Design a protein around this ligand. Structure first.
Ligand SMILES: Cn1ccnc1[C@@H](c1ccccc1)N1C[C@@H](C(N)=O)CC1=O
Ligand SMILES: [Zn+2]
Length: 139
C-alpha cells in the first residue's frame, strides 16, 4: 500500500483504490494503473519534473529504501492478475530490485522529488508508474 499527497490530491495504484477514492474521483487510467482522488487536507509531497533515471524507492516487504537505476516511461506488457487481464501498461519504468504484491504504492524519488509509485514486480524486477508528466497535480 501507499499514496502520494500533493495539494488537494491523493495518487494511488488504480487496482488498490478504495470506495472513497472512487466517490471523490478526479482522474483514472486503467492502462497506467493510476487513480487520483480529491482530499480535504493539503499535501506537501513535491513532484519531480525531470528525465532522471536514478532514484530511491521504499520496499515495504523489506522495510528498506533501495537506490535503483530505472528505465524511461514506456509501454510494457504486464501478465494477467486478479486485477487486470494481460495487457500493455503505459508510462511504466523498470529497475532491478525487490518487489512482491503488497509493495505497490511505495514511492520512488530522485534529487527533484516524487517520480512515481511501485506498480509491478516479480522476476527480480520492479515496475514504477511514472507521475512526472501529470503537471496538473501541482495546480
Ligand atoms: C501480474 N504482475 C505482473 C508483474 N507484476 C505483477 C503484479 C505484482 C505487482 C507488484 C509486485 C509483485 C507483483 N501486479 C502488477 C499490477 C499491475 N500494475 O497490473 C497488478 C498485479 O497484481
Ligand atoms: Zn529528477
Amino acid at each position: 500500500s501507499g499514496a502520494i499527497y500533493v495539494g488537494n490530491y491523493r495518487v494511488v495504484n488504480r487496482h488498490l483504490a478504495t470506495h472513497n477514492d472512487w466517490a471523490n474521483l478526479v482522474w483514472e487510467d486503467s492502462s497506467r494503473d493510476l487513480l487520483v482522488s480529491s482530499t480535504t487536507a493539503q499535501g506537501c509531497d513535491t513532484i519531480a519534473r525531470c528525465d532522471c533515471q536514478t532514484g530511491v524507492y521504499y520496499c515495504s516487504s523489506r522495510r528498506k529504501h533501495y537506490p535503483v537505476s530505472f528505465s524511461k516511461p514506456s509501454l510494457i506488457f504486464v501478465e494477467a492478475s486478479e486485477y487486470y487481464p494481460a495487457r500493455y501498461q503505459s508510462h511504466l519504468m523498470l529497475a532491478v530490485g525487490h518487489s512482491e504484491p503488497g509493495d505497490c504504492g511505495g514511492i520512488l524519488r530522485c534529487q527533484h522529488g516524487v517520480v512515481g509509485i511501485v506498480s509491478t514486480g516479480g522476476n527480480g524486477l520492479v515496475g514504477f508508474a511514472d507521475v512526472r508528466d501529470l503537471l496538473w497535480l501541482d495546480e
